[PDB]
Specification:
By secondary structure, the protein is mainly beta. The chain has helices spanning 99-104, 109-118, and strands spanning 2-11, 14-19, 22-25, 30-35, 43-44, 64-67, 72-77, 87-92.
Length: 120
Amino acid sequence: ENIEVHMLNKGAEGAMVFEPAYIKANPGDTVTFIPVDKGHNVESIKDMIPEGAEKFKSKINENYVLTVTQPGAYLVKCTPHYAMGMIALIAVGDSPANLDQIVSAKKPKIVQERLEKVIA
Ligand SMILES: [Cu+2]
């Protein structure tokens, strides 16, 4: 199955957001990222993707289709707006083994605060 995600300047959680910011998927699913507003992309955060997953980075303003294989948690960001809290959490399969590690990792406070809310 496919899950559509919008990249917006302003959404429910404030400025610079991914909607939804919490994506539940299974191996083989696709996640389609649509930059509804310009100035956004999607990029995997180093050490915040499952062991064995492929690192990825889309072009600013491009529709990006990500195929998810490896089970686990993935924290993606918008390159330009990471520091403003523009992130999404992809959970592939049940009980992602690296989720606690990701929650604990060093990241901007705003990011930290948005992550804590998506998880809740
Ligand atoms: Cu952005």
